[PDB]
Structure formats: structure tokens, C-alpha cells
Design an enzyme around this catalytic site. Structure first.
Site, PDB file in Angstrom:
ATOM      1  N   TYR A 140       0.815  -1.194   0.000  1.00 56.88           N
ATOM      2  CA  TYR A 140       0.000   0.000   0.000  1.00 56.88           C
ATOM      3  C   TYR A 140       0.856   1.254   0.000  1.00 56.88           C
ATOM      4  O   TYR A 140       2.025   1.251   0.393  1.00 56.88           O
ATOM      5  CB  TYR A 140      -0.931   0.050   1.209  1.00 56.88           C
ATOM      6  CG  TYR A 140      -0.209   0.288   2.504  1.00 56.88           C
ATOM      7  CD1 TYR A 140       0.450  -0.759   3.162  1.00 56.88           C
ATOM      8  CD2 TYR A 140      -0.164   1.539   3.094  1.00 56.88           C
ATOM      9  CE1 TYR A 140       1.124  -0.563   4.361  1.00 56.88           C
ATOM     10  CE2 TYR A 140       0.534   1.737   4.308  1.00 56.88           C
ATOM     11  CZ  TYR A 140       1.176   0.675   4.914  1.00 56.88           C
ATOM     12  OH  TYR A 140       1.854   0.807   6.108  1.00 56.88           O
ATOM     13  N   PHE A 168       2.177   9.640   3.591  1.00 57.32           N
ATOM     14  CA  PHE A 168       2.480   9.373   4.988  1.00 57.32           C
ATOM     15  C   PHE A 168       2.962   7.956   5.253  1.00 57.32           C
ATOM     16  O   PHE A 168       3.472   7.699   6.348  1.00 57.32           O
ATOM     17  CB  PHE A 168       1.295   9.712   5.916  1.00 57.32           C
ATOM     18  CG  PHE A 168       0.069   8.876   5.689  1.00 57.32           C
ATOM     19  CD1 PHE A 168      -0.093   7.645   6.301  1.00 57.32           C
ATOM     20  CD2 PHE A 168      -0.954   9.337   4.885  1.00 57.32           C
ATOM     21  CE1 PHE A 168      -1.232   6.876   6.082  1.00 57.32           C
ATOM     22  CE2 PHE A 168      -2.087   8.570   4.670  1.00 57.32           C
ATOM     23  CZ  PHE A 168      -2.219   7.349   5.276  1.00 57.32           C
ATOM     24  N   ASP A 169       2.838   7.036   4.293  1.00 56.00           N
ATOM     25  CA  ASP A 169       3.267   5.671   4.525  1.00 56.00           C
ATOM     26  C   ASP A 169       3.317   4.946   3.187  1.00 56.00           C
ATOM     27  O   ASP A 169       2.574   5.261   2.249  1.00 56.00           O
ATOM     28  CB  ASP A 169       2.271   4.994   5.482  1.00 56.00           C
ATOM     29  CG  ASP A 169       2.835   3.807   6.194  1.00 56.00           C
ATOM     30  OD1 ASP A 169       4.027   3.480   5.997  1.00 56.00           O
ATOM     31  OD2 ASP A 169       2.059   3.178   6.960  1.00 56.00           O
ATOM     32  N   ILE A 202      -7.320   0.156  10.577  1.00 58.12           N
ATOM     33  CA  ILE A 202      -8.458   1.051  10.547  1.00 58.12           C
ATOM     34  C   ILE A 202      -9.656   0.359   9.894  1.00 58.12           C
ATOM     35  O   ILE A 202      -9.526  -0.545   9.057  1.00 58.12           O
ATOM     36  CB  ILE A 202      -8.146   2.387   9.851  1.00 58.12           C
ATOM     37  CG1 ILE A 202      -7.694   2.193   8.408  1.00 58.12           C
ATOM     38  CG2 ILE A 202      -7.137   3.180  10.669  1.00 58.12           C
ATOM     39  CD1 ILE A 202      -7.566   3.488   7.608  1.00 58.12           C
ATOM     40  N   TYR A 216      -8.690   7.408  11.510  1.00 60.58           N
ATOM     41  CA  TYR A 216      -8.133   7.728  12.824  1.00 60.58           C
ATOM     42  C   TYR A 216      -8.956   8.772  13.577  1.00 60.58           C
ATOM     43  O   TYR A 216      -8.553   9.214  14.659  1.00 60.58           O
ATOM     44  CB  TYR A 216      -6.676   8.144  12.708  1.00 60.58           C
ATOM     45  CG  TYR A 216      -5.798   7.047  12.170  1.00 60.58           C
ATOM     46  CD1 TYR A 216      -5.275   6.079  13.002  1.00 60.58           C
ATOM     47  CD2 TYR A 216      -5.518   6.960  10.821  1.00 60.58           C
ATOM     48  CE1 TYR A 216      -4.467   5.061  12.503  1.00 60.58           C
ATOM     49  CE2 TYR A 216      -4.707   5.959  10.312  1.00 60.58           C
ATOM     50  CZ  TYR A 216      -4.186   5.009  11.159  1.00 60.58           C
ATOM     51  OH  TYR A 216      -3.370   4.017  10.684  1.00 60.58           O
ATOM     52  N   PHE A 239      -5.769   5.766  -0.028  1.00 62.65           N
ATOM     53  CA  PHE A 239      -4.859   4.651  -0.148  1.00 62.65           C
ATOM     54  C   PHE A 239      -4.936   4.017  -1.520  1.00 62.65           C
ATOM     55  O   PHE A 239      -6.021   3.886  -2.096  1.00 62.65           O
ATOM     56  CB  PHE A 239      -5.177   3.539   0.849  1.00 62.65           C
ATOM     57  CG  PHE A 239      -4.986   3.923   2.290  1.00 62.65           C
ATOM     58  CD1 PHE A 239      -3.743   3.791   2.909  1.00 62.65           C
ATOM     59  CD2 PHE A 239      -6.052   4.384   3.052  1.00 62.65           C
ATOM     60  CE1 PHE A 239      -3.583   4.116   4.253  1.00 62.65           C
ATOM     61  CE2 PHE A 239      -5.895   4.709   4.381  1.00 62.65           C
ATOM     62  CZ  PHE A 239      -4.660   4.575   4.983  1.00 62.65           C
TER      63      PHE A 239
HETATM   64  N1  LIG Z   1      -3.752   0.778  11.844  1.00 59.00           N
HETATM   65  C1  LIG Z   1      -3.638   0.702  10.508  1.00 59.00           C
HETATM   66  O1  LIG Z   1      -4.616   0.698   9.741  1.00 59.00           O
HETATM   67  C2  LIG Z   1      -2.259   0.639   9.936  1.00 59.00           C
HETATM   68  C3  LIG Z   1      -2.030   0.069   8.698  1.00 59.00           C
HETATM   69  C4  LIG Z   1      -0.749   0.030   8.187  1.00 59.00           C
HETATM   70  C5  LIG Z   1       0.272   0.578   8.937  1.00 59.00           C
HETATM   71  N2  LIG Z   1       0.084   1.145  10.133  1.00 59.00           N
HETATM   72  C6  LIG Z   1      -1.165   1.166  10.610  1.00 59.00           C
END
Ligand SMILES: NC(=O)c1cccnc1
Ligand SMILES: NC(=O)c1cccnc1
Ligand SMILES: [Cl-]
Ligand code: NA
Ligand code: NA
Length: 128
Positions: free
Chosen positions: A45, A55-56, A75, A101, A118
Site C-alpha cells: 500500500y 504518509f506511509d 483502521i 483515525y 490509499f
Molecule cells: N492501523 C492501521 O490501519 C495501519 C495500517 C498500516 C500501517 N500502520 C497502521
């Protein structure tokens, strides 16, 4: 761009039909089967904030992200979105904060009340 397109053209995949998670399938996956509750799911992802910042990314780590589906380990938008996916599928998800969140946010980078974008690839799923 892609976030605007999923916002304006995505499908509501929520059971409440509250628009909280919108989806577009970008690459059609294999077969018909979707994962089972409790399966180990393996995803790649990337996530972006509504200000455009990444952010990731699991790609940048050279390893997938692994979790057990439907258990609240991620989440809400991911539990309900990944449940809709086939193996090999790539989708876009546009997630309101109630499915992400919330008012808390998540340090370091996710502010309060954030809508998130995402791109997710479902690499594999396995019952353990
Ligand atoms: N808590 C999450 O959805 C999540 C997913 C991937 C990385 N960090 C957190
Ligand atoms: N979670 C879903 O919407 C869904 C529907 C049908 C099959 N697998 C998943
Ligand atoms: Cl884009
Ligand atoms: Na597009
Ligand atoms: Na699908």
C-alpha cells in the site's frame, strides 16, 4: 488526480451506505474469491493525506504489511475494503475519518479529522 477521482467517482462500500469508504478497482484481480474473516492478508500500500503528502508506503520498506482480516487490527476502512478485494487486485480507497483515525489522528503524520487516500494491492490471503 487519483484522490479527487475516487472522491467523485468511487463506489460506497460501507454497509451503512454513509459514503465513509469509497472504492475504485484499478487492477482486476484473480478469480472470484475474497478473503475470509480471520485470514492472514498480505498487502502492499501507499497512503496520502488530503494535503497531498505521502504518509506511509510498504513498497518503500521492501516488505508487505500483514494482518488478520476483520479483527480491528487496522483502521475500519481497511477491514471493510480489503474484505471486498480479490487476490491480485489493486484498488483506491477514499476514507473519511470515522473509518480511519477519527479526531485522535495518529502521530507522527496523521492529523485530527483526516480523510485519507490509499492505493492497496491484495497480494495473498491464507487461512491459518
Ligand atoms: N492501523 C492501521 O490501519 C495501519 C495500517 C498500516 C500501517 N500502520 C497502521
Ligand atoms: N465485503 C464485501 O462486500 C463482500 C461481498 C461479497 C463477497 N466478499 C466480500
Ligand atoms: Cl493522482
Ligand atoms: Na482516473
Ligand atoms: Na473486488
Amino acid at each position: 488526480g487519483a484522490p479527487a477521482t475516487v472522491t467523485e467517482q468511487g463506489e460506497d462500500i460501507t454497509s451503512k451506505k454513509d459514503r465513509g469508504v469509497l472504492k475504485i478497482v484499478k487492477r482486476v484481480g484473480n478469480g472470484e474469491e475474497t478473503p475470509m474473516i480471520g485470514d492472514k492478508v498480505y498487502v502492499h500500500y501507499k497512503g496520502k493525506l488530503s494535503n497531498g503528502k505521502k504518509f506511509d508506503s510498504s513498497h518503500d520498506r521492501n516488505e508487505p504489511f500483514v494482518f488478520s482480516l476483520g479483527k480491528g487490527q487496522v483502521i475500519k476502512a481497511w477491514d471493510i475494503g480489503v474484505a471486498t478485494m480479490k487476490k491480485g487486485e489493486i484498488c483506491h480507497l477514499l476514507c473519511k475519518p470515522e473509518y480511519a483515525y477519527g479526531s485522535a489522528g495518529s502521530l507522527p503524520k496523521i492529523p485530527s479529522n483526516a480523510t485519507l487516500f490509499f492505493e492497496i494491492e491484495l497480494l495473498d490471503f491464507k487461512g491459518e
